[PDB]
Symmetry: D3
Subunit: 236 residues, 6 copies
Amino acid sequence: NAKPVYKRILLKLSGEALQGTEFGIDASILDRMAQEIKELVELGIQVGVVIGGGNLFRGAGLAKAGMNRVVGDHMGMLATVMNGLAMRDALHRAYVNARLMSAIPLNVCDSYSWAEAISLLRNNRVVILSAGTGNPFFTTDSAACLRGIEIEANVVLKATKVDGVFTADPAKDPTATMYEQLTYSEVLEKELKVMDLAAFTLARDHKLPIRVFNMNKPGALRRVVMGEKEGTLITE
Amino acid sequence: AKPVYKRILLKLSGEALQGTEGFGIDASILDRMAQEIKELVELGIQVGVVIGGGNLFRGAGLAKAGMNRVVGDHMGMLATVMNGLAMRDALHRAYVNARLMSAIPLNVCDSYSWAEAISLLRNNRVVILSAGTGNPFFTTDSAACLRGIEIEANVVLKATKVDGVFTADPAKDPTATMYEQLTYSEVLEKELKVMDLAAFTLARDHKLPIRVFNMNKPGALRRVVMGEKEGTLITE
Amino acid sequence: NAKPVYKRILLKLSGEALQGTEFGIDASILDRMAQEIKELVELGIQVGVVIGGGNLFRGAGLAKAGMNRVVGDHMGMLATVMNGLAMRDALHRAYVNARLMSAIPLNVCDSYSWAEAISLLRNNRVVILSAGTGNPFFTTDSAACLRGIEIEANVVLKATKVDGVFTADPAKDPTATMYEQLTYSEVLEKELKVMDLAAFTLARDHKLPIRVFNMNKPGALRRVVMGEKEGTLITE
Amino acid sequence: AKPVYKRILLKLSGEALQGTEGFGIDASILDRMAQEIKELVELGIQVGVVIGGGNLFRGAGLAKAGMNRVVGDHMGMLATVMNGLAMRDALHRAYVNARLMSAIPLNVCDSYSWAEAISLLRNNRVVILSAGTGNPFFTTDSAACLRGIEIEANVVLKATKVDGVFTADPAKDPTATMYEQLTYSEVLEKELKVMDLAAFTLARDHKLPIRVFNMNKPGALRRVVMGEKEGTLITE
Amino acid sequence: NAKPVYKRILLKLSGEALQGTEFGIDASILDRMAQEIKELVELGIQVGVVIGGGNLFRGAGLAKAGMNRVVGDHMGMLATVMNGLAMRDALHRAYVNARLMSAIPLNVCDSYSWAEAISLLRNNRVVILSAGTGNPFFTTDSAACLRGIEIEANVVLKATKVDGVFTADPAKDPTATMYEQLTYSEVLEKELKVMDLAAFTLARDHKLPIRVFNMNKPGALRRVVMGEKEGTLITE
Amino acid sequence: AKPVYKRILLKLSGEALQGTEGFGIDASILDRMAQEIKELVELGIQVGVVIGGGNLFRGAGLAKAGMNRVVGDHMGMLATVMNGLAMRDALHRAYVNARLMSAIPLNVCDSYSWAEAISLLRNNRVVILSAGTGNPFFTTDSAACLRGIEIEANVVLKATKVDGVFTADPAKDPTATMYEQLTYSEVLEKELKVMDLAAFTLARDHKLPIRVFNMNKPGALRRVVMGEKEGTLITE
Ligand SMILES: O=c1ccn([C@@H]2O[C@H](COP(=O)(O)OP(=O)(O)OP(=O)(O)O)[C@@H](O)[C@H]2O)c(=O)[nH]1
Ligand SMILES: O=c1ccn([C@@H]2O[C@H](COP(=O)(O)OP(=O)(O)OP(=O)(O)O)[C@@H](O)[C@H]2O)c(=O)[nH]1
Ligand SMILES: O=c1ccn([C@@H]2O[C@H](COP(=O)(O)OP(=O)(O)OP(=O)(O)O)[C@@H](O)[C@H]2O)c(=O)[nH]1
Ligand SMILES: O=c1ccn([C@@H]2O[C@H](COP(=O)(O)OP(=O)(O)OP(=O)(O)O)[C@@H](O)[C@H]2O)c(=O)[nH]1
Ligand SMILES: O=c1ccn([C@@H]2O[C@H](COP(=O)(O)OP(=O)(O)OP(=O)(O)O)[C@@H](O)[C@H]2O)c(=O)[nH]1
Ligand SMILES: O=c1ccn([C@@H]2O[C@H](COP(=O)(O)OP(=O)(O)OP(=O)(O)O)[C@@H](O)[C@H]2O)c(=O)[nH]1
C-alpha cells in the first residue's frame, strides 16, 4: 500500500559513481541504474536526471595541469554528455523510454528545451540533461538545482557514494559522521559538504528540498521515493 | 634543405596523448606535441590533424559489454573531440593558430567544412579534424585517409609508438626488422599490420602515400618532413 | 496465407530508376513506388529507404569535366536529397507516414539520427535516408549497407533496372546473363557487378544478405518480400 | 574610363548554365562565366550573384504533375543551391574568392546573413545567394530584387539570352525592336515582359535600377558595367 | 446546431492589439485570447496563428531614426517572436496544445517547417508562426497570406482593433465608414486600407478569402467562425 | 598618459538605452554610446559588452502577471538581443567593427563562442554578448561577471545613471555620500547595493575587479579607463 511520496523528481547522478573501480564506465552499474529507474517510471514517477562527468574530466583539475580553464570546463561538459549517452542506451535496452538533451546544442542527441522537457516528462519519458548549465565555472550540482527548479521537481535526489552528508570525507577522515536531517541554515553554520554555495543557495532560495543518498546501495533510490529511512534530508 | 611536403595529414592515435597510467590525457606530452607541430607551421608546412579516441573509448569494446554498437561508436567519436579540444588548447597556448572542426555538428567547436578547411590550411592554420568520418563502423584511420584525400595532402603521416613497420611486433619478437619502404601490394601480401583494412584500401585506390613513424622519438616528425631517413614509407 | 518473410528492410532506390525516359523525375513511377511501399507498410513491414542521385549528378562524372571532386560529390548528395523529397511527398499523397532525413543537416527536412530513425520505424513510419553517408568519395550503395546495418535491417533490397546481377551490362553486352544466387565469395571470384567493394565488403563483413531486383517490374518488390522467386540473392 | 557601378547584383537564370542539351550544367559555360566575373572583381566591383534553378526544377511545373506545390518550390530552391555550388567552384578554380550563402540553412555552404554578406562584399569576395527568398510562391527574380535592395547594390543586372528588352520576342517576330531605356511605368503600360510582377513591383518601390542584357554576347557584362551602350536600362 | 463554417483558419494577430493601453503586452488580453482560441480548438477547428510585432518595433520606423532598415526589420521580427512566445505560454496555461515556430531558426522554439506544421494542425495543435516571412521589407500581413496559402487555410482572419475595413482611420478621421463586403477589385478601386499590395495581391492571386474583425470584441472571433454577422469579408 | 586597462567588460543596463519615455531604445543615446566606445577601440582597448533588457522585459515581473517564470526569462533574454542588435548597428554606423554573439543560438547574429570571442577581441572588434548566461533565474549582471572571467577582462565596468556607489540612494536621500573604493567584504557588510548577489559573489571568488560609474556623465567612460578619479572601484 506504500505509494510513492514524490510525483516528479530530479535525480542528480555523480559522474564518479559510474566508475566502480579502475576511471571510465561500469556497464553493470549502468544496467542496475536502468532497472531502478525503470521501477520509478512504472510507479508513475516523472524522472529527470542530471548526470556529471567527474569520472572522465574536471575543468579545474585540467586547469592546474596548465590548460585553459574554460576549455577544461568544456571537456568536463562533453564528459557529462558521454555519460548521458551511455545512461540513455542502458535505459533503452531495459525498454525504458528516454531522451538525451544537451545544454550545448549537439547533433548525438537533442538540444535541451524547457517546454519539450516538460512534455516528455508528462509523457512518462525519462529525461537526461547533459552538459550541465552549458557554462564554464559551474558544476553539475548547480545544473541539478537549476533544472530541478525549471521542470518544477518536488525534490532533488543527489546520488552519491556515501550514505548521506558527513562532517568530513568518510573515506579519509576517521572522525566523519553523517546527519540525517539539516536545514539550509545548519548546512552553512556547520559548513558541511553537500554541493557548492552557487548550487545550494539557489536551491535554498527556491525552497527546493534535497535528499542525499548512496546509489551504490541497491534499492536505496526506491526507499527514498517510497518515503523510507534513507540518506539525509535538507529542507528549510 | 627545405621540407619535402607542402601539406600533410597527421594522424595521431588516441593513445598518443596517454600518460604512463594508460588512459586520458597527459598535459606534458600534449605540450610537447604542440612544439613539434609549431615547428612545421613555421617551416611553411600546412597541417591537418586527425586524432583518435582509444585513450578513452572504443565502440566494439563497449558493444562487447552489452551496449548498442552504434551508441558505442558515437561515444568513441565524441572522445576524439575531447582529444581534439585538448590538442587545440595546447596549440593555442604555444601560440599556434589552430581550429577544431568536427564531423559531428557540435555548435565548443565548429563543423567540418571542406572549403573552409582548405582556406584555413592556405592561411597557415592547423586544422584539427575530430569525430572521424561521422559514422559508426569506421575508425579514425579511415577518417585520416578520407580527409587526407579531400584536402589533397601530399601524404598521411601515421604516428605510432614504434620506429616504423616491422616484420612482426619488435617488442614481442626480437627477430623483427623494419621496412624502409613498401607498396600497398606488399603490405597486403605479407599480411603486414599498418592500419584498418577499409582505410588502407581507400588510400591505395587514390594513391595517397603513407608514412609510418615514431611520434615519441624526438625530431622524428621533423626528420620525416625533411626527407631524411625516418620510419616506413608506403606508396604505389 | 503467404505472410512476409522480412520484418524490417532497407530499400536502396537507384536514382537513375526515377527517370524513366528523357533525366529528372518520372512522377508516375514515383506514384507507383508509393503505392508499392504502402502495401509493405500495411503488411507490417518496417521500411527504411536509401535513395541515390544518379538521375541528376554523379561526383566523379563532374570531376572529369574539371570540377573539384569533393564539390562534385556534394552536388551528387544534394541530388539524393531532391529525390528523397519527391519520394516523401509521393508517400504523403498516398497517405503513408514518412519522414525525410539527411546525412548532411539541412533545414527542408530532418537531420539523420539513429535513435530517432529506430523509433520512427518501430512506429511504422517510412524513413527516407538522403545524402548517403554524408561524405564524398562514397556511393549511396555504401550508405544502404551502412544504414542497413545501423537500423538492423533483415536484408538490403537493391532496386535496379535489371532483373538481377548479370555477367555484363545486359543493355550493352549481348552475352550478359544473370545468376539467381551468389555468395559474397562467388561475387568476387566471378567479379560480377553488384555494388563497389567498399559497400559490398561491409555488407559481407556483417553478414547482411542482399537481394537485387527490378523496380520497373510492377509487383516485384512485393514478391521479394513475400518470398517468391524474384531477382538474385547474395548471402554467405 | 573606370566602372560606373561600385556594387551590383548579378541575377543569372538557371538556364544560363544549360548546355545545348537544354538541362543541367555545362562546365565550359560555367568556366566562361567565372572569367567574366573575375574581371569585374579585379576592376574593383563588388559582386553579389543570385542564380535560378530552371535548368533543373520549377515548383509550378512539378505541381501540375501532381506534387504538393510547396514541396515543388523546395526542390526548385534546392536546385538553385546546386547551381550556386557549381558556380562557386568555377570561381574558386579561376582563383576568385567567393562564398555560397543559402536562404535555406544547409550546414556544403553557410547561411545567408545580411551583415556577413556586406562584409564579404566590402572584402572583394563574390557573394553567391542561393535558395532565392527561402519561401515558396516566389521566383529567384524576386530574390534578386530583394537581396539587391538589402545589400544596397547600385543596380540589378538581369542576364538573359537576348540583347535587351524588345517590343515582342525577336526570335518569334522579326518586327521587334530593342528599347535602350525604360521606366517601370512604361514597362507595365506597354505590357512588356521583364520579370516576375511581384519582383518588378518591389524594385519599383525602392527605385532599384534594372539592366537587362545578354550574358552570351562576349564583353557584354563588362560593357554594361563600363557605362557603354549595352542592353536595356530600367529606372524611375 | 450552429456548427463552424471553417475547418482550418489562419488567424493573423496584430502586434499592437496585445498592448491595450500604455506599449508591451497586456496579460489579461493574452489570457482572453487563449480562452477564445481554446474554444475553436474544441470545436474541431485547426488554428494557425501569425502574430505581428508592432507593439514593440517596426523596421521602417526605426529606419527614420537612422538605423539600418534591414537591422530594423530584424528587430521587428524578434518582436513577433516575443509575442509568439507570450501567446504560446498563455495557451499552455489554458491547457491548449500549442507550438511556436520561427521563420528565422532560433533555439527558444521550433524552426518553421511546412510538413511539420501540417502534421501539428491535423493533430489539433495550435501553430504559432513567428518572424513573419523571415525577410526584411515585408510585413506580417504578407506572412499571414503566405502561410495561409501554404497550410491551405480556408480563410485568413485578420484580427484588428476596429470592426472592419474603414474608408479612413476611424480614430482620426470623423468621416470614416466601414464596408461589410468587398471584392479584391473594389478594395483597389476604392483604395481602402486592408493590408499592403504585396500581401493582398498574393491573397487575391490565390483566391484566399479574408475576413477583418475586431479582437478587442470578446466573442467576435467565435461569431466569425460560426458564420454570424461580424467584420468585413473580402472575396473575389 | 595611456589607458590602464587592456581588456574590459562593459555592462550596460537595458535602461541605459531608454529615452525620456522610460521604455524602448532612443536612437540619439545609442549613437552617443557608439562614439564613446569608438574612442576606447582607437585607444587600443579591447571591449566586450553585456547589455540588459529592463527597458523591455523582466522575467520576475512577467511571472507576477501569471506567466511561466522560465518563459518570462526567455523573453527577457530575447530583449537583450534586441538591444544588442541596435547597439551593434549604431557601432557599425559609427564605423566600428563589432559582432553580436548570443548565449541562445539565433542563426540575426551568431552564437557565443569563447574561442571566437577571444579572437575577435584580439583583432580589435567590439564583442557584444546577448542573452545573458542563456539560463533563466539569472540576471545580465551575472553574465557580465561570468563573461568577464571567461574572456579574462581586466575589469568589469558597471554603467549606471549615478556617479558611483553611495551610502544610500542620493536621489531619495541628500545625506548619501559616494565611496571612492570598496572591497567585496565591505559591500556585503554595509549592505550596499552594487548588483545581483549571485553575480557579485562570483566576481569575488575570481577576484574580478568592478568599477561602478555614470554612463550619462560625458567623458566618464574615458576617465574611468584613463585611471582618472571617476566612480567607485571594488576589489579584494
Ligand atoms: O554547469 C556546468 C557543469 C559542469 N561543468 C564541467 O563539467 C565537469 C564535470 O564535473 P561534475 O561536477 O559534473 O562532476 P561529478 O558530478 O562527477 O562530480 P561530483 O558531483 O562527485 O563532485 C566540471 O568539473 C566542470 O568543469 C561546467 O563547466 N559547467
Ligand atoms: O569514423 C569514425 C572514427 C572513430 N569511431 C569510434 O572511435 C573509436 C576509437 O577508435 P579510433 O580509431 O579513434 O582509435 P585510435 O585512433 O585511438 O586507435 P588506433 O586505431 O590508432 O589504434 C572507435 O572504436 C569507434 O567507436 C567511429 O565509430 N567512427
Ligand atoms: O555516401 C555518399 C553517397 C553519395 N555521394 C554522391 O552522390 C552521387 C549520387 O550517386 P549515387 O551512387 O547515389 O547514384 P545512383 O544511386 O543513382 O546510381 P547507381 O546506384 O545506379 O550506380 C554520387 O555520384 C556521389 O558523388 C557521396 O558523395 N557520398
Ligand atoms: O524564392 C524562391 C525562388 C525560387 N523558387 C523555386 O525555384 C524554381 C525555379 O524558378 P527560378 O525563378 O529559380 O527560375 P530561373 O531563374 O532559372 O528562371 P527564370 O525565372 O529566370 O526564367 C521556382 O519555380 C520555384 O519552385 C521558390 O519557390 N522560391
Ligand atoms: O515578413 C516580415 C514580417 C515582419 N517584419 C518586421 O516586423 C515588424 C513588425 O511589424 P508587423 O507588421 O508585424 O506589425 P503589426 O502586425 O503589429 O502591425 P499592424 O499589422 O497593426 O500594421 C515590421 O515592421 C517589419 O520590420 C519583417 O521584416 N518581415
Ligand atoms: O542570464 C540571464 C540574463 C537575463 N535574464 C532575463 O532578462 C531580464 C532582464 O534583466 P536584466 O538583468 O537583463 O536587466 P537589466 O540589466 O536591464 O537591469 P539591471 O539589472 O541592470 O537593473 C531578467 O529579468 C530575466 O528575465 C535571464 O533570465 N537570464
